């Protein structure tokens, strides 16, 4: 397995995201996500940039929440993000805003 794929796979695994969840975020079938993270060839549609961005967010989020709560956080409407889910922001290319929020959480910014 190529190291890029296993590194991304490791980041997502520590968040406990399912292949279905990852698929909805990176616009790919669950099987395509499973194959990609296993380092197999994927001719289908799959947004690699979104997968890497998801990995950034998963790793960053582990600093501020334990796995269970981190997982739930991804799919919970967040009043700090105008009642949007962080998973949807990542899906739609706004991972930087999610990373900013996580850094605020890590610095104990009063909400």
């Amino acid at each position: 397995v190529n190291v890029l794929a296993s590194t991304v796979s490791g980041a997502i695994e520590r968040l406990g995201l399912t292949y279905e969840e990852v698929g909805d975020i990176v616009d790919a079938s669950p099987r395509s996500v499973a194959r990609w993270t296993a380092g197999q060839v994927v001719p289908q549609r799959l947004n690699k940039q979104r997968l890497i961005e998801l990995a950034y967010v998963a790793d960053a989020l582990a600093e501020v929440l334990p796995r269970d709560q981190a997982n739930v956080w991804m799919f919970s409407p967040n009043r700090l993000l105008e009642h949007r889910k962080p998973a949807d922001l990542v899906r739609d290319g706004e991972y930087q805003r999610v990373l900013a929020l996580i850094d605020a959480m890590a610095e104990g910014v009063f909400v």
């Binding site: 582990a62 600093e63 501020v64 929440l65 334990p66 269970d68 709560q69 739930v72 956080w73 919970s76 967040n78 009043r79 700090l80 805003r97 990373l99 900013a100 929020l101 850094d103 605020a104 959480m105 890590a106 610095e107 104990g108 910014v109 009063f110 909400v111």
Partner: protein, 182 residues
Amino acid sequence: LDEGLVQRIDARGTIEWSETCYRYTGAHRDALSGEGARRFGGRWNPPLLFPAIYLADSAQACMVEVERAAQAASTTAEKMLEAAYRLHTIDVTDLAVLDLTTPQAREAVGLENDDIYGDDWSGCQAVGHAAWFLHMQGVLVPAAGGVGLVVTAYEQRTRPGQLQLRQSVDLTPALYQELRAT
């Protein structure tokens, strides 16, 4: 950047404030960093213009903020603190701050209860921005559990020793429940 608001804030001026304060961060973060608030914004600062550090005037008031952050992250303080956080005790000395701890002071700069409790930060952010613009060292604000201090552009604006880290301890669930108590 409203001329009238800047004028009014200048008229209030600052007071020199000293207190033992409390902040919590992830265990790896520097106790005096303010880049998080800069990247995302906070109630009392717009994003992208300056670092800002949020502190509370007691451990109890700080724990209330821990609880509020947990709530915003859709969980409880006890569960959030399963991730490694630390509680910092930071002495503040002679900090020149805009004092907004009274409703009269807040009303004088156009802020009312909805501004301090509600989801719209625009008012408090404009006031924090103007204070920083006038080279004030920070803003004294109401905090859910007591008095809050927002230190704006610490590194540039403060003299040696105005902020001093005195102590850092693991903020465990146990420490939280102990400190949260009445």
